[PDB]
Amino acid sequence: SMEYEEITLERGNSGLGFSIAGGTDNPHIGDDPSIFITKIIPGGAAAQDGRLRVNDSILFVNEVDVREVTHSAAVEALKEAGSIVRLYVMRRKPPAEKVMEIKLIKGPKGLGFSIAGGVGNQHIPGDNSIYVTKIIEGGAAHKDGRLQIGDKILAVNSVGLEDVMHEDAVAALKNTYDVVYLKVAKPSNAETMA
Numbered sequence: 001s002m003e004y005e006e007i008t009l010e011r012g013n014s015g016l017g018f019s020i021a022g023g024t025d026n027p028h029i030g031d032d033p034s035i036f037i038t039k040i041i042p043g044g045a046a047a048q049d050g051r052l053r054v055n056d057s058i059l060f061v062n063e064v065d066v067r068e069v070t071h072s073a074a075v076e077a078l079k080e081a082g083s084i085v086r087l088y089v090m091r092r093k094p095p096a097e098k099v100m101e102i103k104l105i106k107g108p109k110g111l112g113f114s115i116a117g118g119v120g121n122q123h124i125p126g127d128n129s130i131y132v133t134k135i136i137e138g139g140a141a142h143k144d145g146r147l148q149i150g151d152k153i154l155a156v157n158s159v160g161l162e163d164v165m166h167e168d169a170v171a172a173l174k175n176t177y178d179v180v181y182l183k184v185a186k187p188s189n190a191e192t193m194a
Contacts, residue, residue: 001093007051011083017044018052020078023071029125035066035074036125053091055126060088092124096188099154102146104180111173111180112139113147118166130161130169152185
């Protein structure tokens with residue numbers, strides 16, 4: 001569900017008008033060495049054009065491939081890009097989702113899964129959503145067999161997890177006993193084996 005767009009900007013007196021973070025030497029989100037837009041400077045070229053967005057990823061600058069380069073190499077690619085700069089960016093489209101309620105019994109071994117995300121620890125650029133990253137084999141979640149990696153936890157019991165800090169999500173998952181209702185979001189589109 002990735003969306004690509006070529007954005008052509010005319011360099012101005014104050015530059016192109018945006019800030020970047022990332023590079024093979026300083027992953028903006030750990031591991032991923034992509035060059036991300038972190039800010040759109042008001043009044044600048046990027047802002048006036050209106051197409052560039054925070055969390056957009058710059059894959060190419062004119063003919064230069066910056067998908068896997070050092071931060072400095074990207075800054076230089078941009079500084080040397082001339083007056084008319086063609087930015088080829090990528091931004092993710094949120095997949096179609098279907099809500100599902102999963103009831104787990106919390107035993108001594110706990111819920112048996114790991115999560116990532118939340119404000120202050122986003123799992124995907126832009127995305128404050130709480131995601132399942134791991135499901136312990138033989139664990140409660142596993143035994144039930146419904147919860148899957150990539151699933152979004154929208155709520156725990158009556159507690160919503162939209163736009164919350166990572167710590168608050170963890171607290172919501174821990175403030176539980178016996179019966180636990182996980183409201184989850186799974187990708188709508190699916191195929192069935194016949």
